[PDB]
Write a protein that binds this DNA or RNA. Structure first.
Lengths: 180, 139, 162, 181
RNA sequence: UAGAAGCAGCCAUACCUUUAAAGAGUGCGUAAUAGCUCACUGGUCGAGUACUUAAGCGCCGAUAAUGUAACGGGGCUAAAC
């Protein structure tokens, strides 16, 4: 296996963790998250820290080691600091606005897209071309940002579309780059 | 601090503010004519037509400090041994012989731009450059 | 596949030990972000000052110092640290380090002068401190100050009778 | 010194089927002859042989110990199957451990010569040299660095720096091993 | 060559120095550079890793026309080897 599976989990003071009957509950300042843990892996809370090990050494257990370590770590980092993933809308005439728990997108299509925001997740604007999804669950935050991006995937000729801020779009040329 | 760093090669004793010097000086807000005058003043004591390397640092205050280092070692060796065009097959087609004394003199002269601490090391750098140019080392 | 690594490490340990035994005073500098040109200039200045600055593996240096009775804090080896040995002008080496700290991001992480582990404050004070010739000049000036004051006072008193 | 020692034990099988069974048990049938003795039939551990003598030449010499005796033997022959990397018989020629003997030994060329660097012509006149030693000290191959050999230079046989108890035997001492013209 | 500044192309890189380590440069991309990266080496971490060889089972390659139709069927993680 590999060191991420065995690396210990620090517990912030404000954050409480508990394990019982193949379930884990992590209660923090900003919310409460739950997880299932499989039989072959054992999770322990001691000395204000979380440790994980395996009863067996089958490869399923080997992978599970790291998988559940990472999940519980993201389960604890969420309840303390929360997860946030951001987006940028670039292009002529592209706009985003918010009303209540839904977003309205103007993305060149002949219809203005409404977008219900799932619960447990907040959305933050910066003008009308910058978005930032915040929430308790990294999985949910990534899901929402991805589905918004899928609403209008970017393009390489001019950078138009909805891009992750951290993403780098490879760019091509059109007419004038082929100039002889 | 220097806003822009430029590295160029200039013709010693023939520094003029033409298209090349203007392109070099305009990008960093540096006076191309003033740099050409300074290069001519410095390279008057250099060989006419010698390609002296020039390093120019242009700060944010529009000032430019331009220093002309030792000219190209390949050019100096070609001038010393009568070499004008580099031999293509520098591994086999020798273009000339680089004398030991001439190499020592050239290394001592160009030691300003060479970061060696030994005169033998400088002479070895000159000899390696001569081999790369195709000049047969002098025994 | 391991004998060659052992041989290279042994040669590195021997060279480092030769430097450490030849250096009367030593220091460690964290030079992260020190550009190639800045490092070349700093090494040239150290060479002019007679010091030898070079990068030494942290584990090898710690083992060699433990063997040689160098009981310093491992925080000095924490971080990419060039070891600079200066045997004559410790004040000059410290002043050069302070000048590099002003003109760049290099930090003087640890120091060892006469077997004394100099921390940040002690190292800064030593670097600001001058050399032996300058110290002699300053002591001479301080000693002569009372004599100059007495001579000036005597001249003023004699003139006051004009 | 161990790396020149080889453990065996006697076999009395003597058949094609028997030899196949042995090699299945991951050993190597082998015979030892020489010095006018009766041939000795024995078997060797394949893993040990591979580990120690993965590069064996005609001039390799080694020691066989059956727990009760020592023998100094040349690897006279080894029947190798290339496709399966499988040794399947070894012939050991015994010699007297204290009798000086001759043997052609190959040369190994190292370094880049100045003459060839500058336009010299390699001509490897001699691929081997007749040397002389007791069996346990014969050199596997004799090294020769060409780096100082400039243009128009030939290599004398005495010029070959030689292992301690190894000595030249050529009648023509002044013949050239490799020339660079 | 017009350019070729490491990255049309010829030749080697027996080219040296400061060398920690820096290749006549790994790729991307610029008419030409410029520019971004890597081998290369240093610190944080803390044991096996990186390339291969022989076997025992496996994966993809797998692909026709009335109807599942290349276990006799049901089903079987052994009730398979």
């Amino acid at each position: 296996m590999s060191r991420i599976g065995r690396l210990p989990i620090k517990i912030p003071d404000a954050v409480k963790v508990d394990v019982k009957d193949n379930l884990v509950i992590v209660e923090g300042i900003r919310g409460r998250l739950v997880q299932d843990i499989k039989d072959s892996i054992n999770v322990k809370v001691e000395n204000g820290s979380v440790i994980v090990d395996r009863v067996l050494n089958d490869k399923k257990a080997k992978a599970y080691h790291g998988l559940y370590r990472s999940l519980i770590f993201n389960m604890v980092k969420g309840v303390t600091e929360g997860f946030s993933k951001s987006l940028t809308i670039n292009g002529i005439g592209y706009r985003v606005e918010q009303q209540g728990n839904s977003l309205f997108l103007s993305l060149g299509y002949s219809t203005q897209f409404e977008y219900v925001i799932p619960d447990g997740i907040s959305v933050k604007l910066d003008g009308n071309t910058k978005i930032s999804v915040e929430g308790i669950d990294k999985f949910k935050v990534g899901q929402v940002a991805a589905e918004i991006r899928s609403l209008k995937k970017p393009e390489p000729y001019k950078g138009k579309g909805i891009k992750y801020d951290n993403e780098v779009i490879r760019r091509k040329v059109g007419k004038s780059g082929v100039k002889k | 601090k220097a806003i822009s760093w430029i590295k160029l090669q200039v013709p010693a004793a023939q520094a003029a503010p033409g298209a090349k010097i203007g392109q070099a000086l305009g990008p960093h807000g540096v006076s191309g004519p003033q740099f050409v005058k300074e290069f001519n003043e410095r390279t008057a004591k250099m060989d006419p037509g010698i390609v002296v390397p020039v390093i120019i640092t242009v700060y944010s205050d529009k000032s430019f400090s331009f220093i002309v280092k030792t000219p190209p070692a390949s050019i100096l060796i070609k001038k010393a041994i009568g070499i004008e065009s580099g031999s293509k097959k520098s591994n086999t087609d020798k273009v000339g012989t680089i004398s030991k004394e001439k190499l020592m003199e050239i290394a001592r002269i160009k030691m300003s731009d060479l970061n060696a601490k030994s005169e033998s090391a400088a002479f070895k750098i000159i000899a390696g450059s001569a081999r790369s140019m195709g000049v047969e080392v002098e025994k | 596949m391991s004998a060659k690594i052992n041989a290279k490490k042994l040669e590195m340990f021997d060279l480092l030990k030769q430097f450490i035994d030849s250096k009367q005073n030593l220091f460690f500098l964290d030079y992260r972000g020190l550009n190639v040109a800045q490092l070349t200039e700093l090494r040239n200045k150290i060479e002019g000052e007679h010091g030898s600055l070079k990068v030494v593996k942290n584990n090898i240096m710690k083992m060699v110092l433990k063997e040689k009775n160098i009981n310093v804090v491992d925080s000095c080896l924490v971080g990419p640290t060039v070891v600079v040995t200066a045997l004559e002008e410790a004040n000059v080496i410290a002043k050069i380090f302070y000048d590099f700290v002003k003109s760049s991001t290099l930090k003087v992480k640890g120091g060892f002068v006469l077997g004394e582990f100099y921390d940040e404050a002690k190292v800064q004070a030593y670097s600001k401190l001058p050399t032996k010739k300058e110290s002699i000049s300053l002591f001479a000036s301080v000693l002569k100050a009372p004599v100059s004051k007495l001579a000036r006072t005597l001249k003023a008193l004699a003139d006051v009778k004009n | 010194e161990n790396s020149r020692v080889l453990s065996c034990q006697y076999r009395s099988s003597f058949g094609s089927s028997n030899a196949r069974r042995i090699r299945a048990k991951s050993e190597i049938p082998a015979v030892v002859y020489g010095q006018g003795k009766d041939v000795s039939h024995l078997r060797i551990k394949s893993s040990e042989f591979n580990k120690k003598f993965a590069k064996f030449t005609d001039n390799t010499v080694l020691i066989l110990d059956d727990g009760k005796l020592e023998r100094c033997v040349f690897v006279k022959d080894a029947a190798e199957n290339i496709a399966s990397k499988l040794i399947y018989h070894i012939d050991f020629y015994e010699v007297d451990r204290n009798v000086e003997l001759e043997k052609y030994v190959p040369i190994k060329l190292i370094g880049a010569s100045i003459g060839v660097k500058e336009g010299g012509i390699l001509t490897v006149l001699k691929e081997q040299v007749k040397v002389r030693s007791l069996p346990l000290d014969l050199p596997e191959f004799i090294e020769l660095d060409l780096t100082p050999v400039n243009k128009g230079d030939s290599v004398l046989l005495k010029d070959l720096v030689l292992p301690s108890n190894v000595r030249l035997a050529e009648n023509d001492e002044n013949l050239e091993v490799v020339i660079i013209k």
